[PDB]
Design a protein around this ligand. Structure first.
Ligand SMILES: NS(=O)(=O)c1cc2c(cc1Cl)N[C@H]([C@H]1C[C@H]3C=C[C@@H]1C3)NS2(=O)=O
Ligand SMILES: NS(=O)(=O)c1cc2c(cc1Cl)N[C@H]([C@H]1C[C@H]3C=C[C@@H]1C3)NS2(=O)=O
Lengths: 49, 49, 49
């Protein structure tokens, strides 16, 4: 009871949670969600015209 | 969970109820039906369904 | 909180320590040093700064 509150006070829980959830961003959208590609227009876009 | 009609807590509950295991640092959820047989510290990580 | 250099709890926590109150249903944050003088239940509502 006195021990877990020390880890909550000193951010050790935050550090462990960061280590085991956020440092292992692996798959796709977390990494590549903030990048940019310009374009290249294909025919599948313009067909109803 | 407990057994019907015999109250036999199996699993990680009965390891602490029946004097088998000494402590359980594990993903265990504080309920109403678990405080009567074992005790919990202050919660260290929040979640939901 | 405690006073500087005297450890004299003013406010509401002193009302529980010095026998003047009985219980405190209140917006009260579970810290470390409040655990060593007065007992807390499980948390009912979670927040952050
Ligand atoms: N952001 S989190 O889920 O990983 C998380 C969740 C919790 C933490 C600490 C962290 Cl890092 N400590 C709190 C405790 C601190 C104090 C207040 C309630 C408890 C006492 N319990 S909690 O609310 O379960
Ligand atoms: N979403 S919230 O902050 O208002 C909130 C926060 C909490 C609630 C219920 C609510 Cl609605 N109950 C939990 C307790 C209920 C059970 C499960 C964990 C504890 C036991 N404490 S809590 O995590 O402090």
């Amino acid at each position: 009871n006195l021990a877990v509150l020390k880890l909550s006070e000193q951010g050790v829980l935050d550090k462990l949670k960061n280590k085991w959830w956020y440092d292992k961003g692996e798959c796709g959208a977390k990494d590549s969600g903030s990048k940019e590609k310009t374009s290249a227009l294909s025919l599948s876009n313009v067909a109803g015209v | 969970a407990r057994d019907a009609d015999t109250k036999i807590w199996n699993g990680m509950v009965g390891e602490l109820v029946y004097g088998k295991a000494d402590i359980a640092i594990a993903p265990l959820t504080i309920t109403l039906v678990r405080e009567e047989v074992i005790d919990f510290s202050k919660p260290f990580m929040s979640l939901g369904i």
